[PDB]
């Protein structure tokens, strides 16, 4: 009946080039998504409870 939730610090990486403050923010979150599309959806966490 338990529900164990695991969290682990992960260093993200952004591409060289793109400017503009808004565009950088979208990329910071794009990195959060690419992490989920390689570790998240395959283990357990949903698209709803996405941290950060």
């Amino acid at each position: 009946n338990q529900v164990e939730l695991k969290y682990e610090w992960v260093e993200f990486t952004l591409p060289e080039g793109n400017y503009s403050e808004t565009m950088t923010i979208d990329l910071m979150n794009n990195a959060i998504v690419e992490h989920y599309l390689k570790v998240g959806r395959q283990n357990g966490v949903l698209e709803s409870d996405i941290g950060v």
Binding site: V33, Y36, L37, R41, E47
Partner: peptide, 13 residues
């Protein structure tokens, strides 16, 4: 249908 794999990207419509 498979059952477990949501590309997570509104491809539709």
């Amino acid at each position: 249908s498979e059952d477990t794999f949501n590309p997570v990207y509104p491809y539709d419509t």
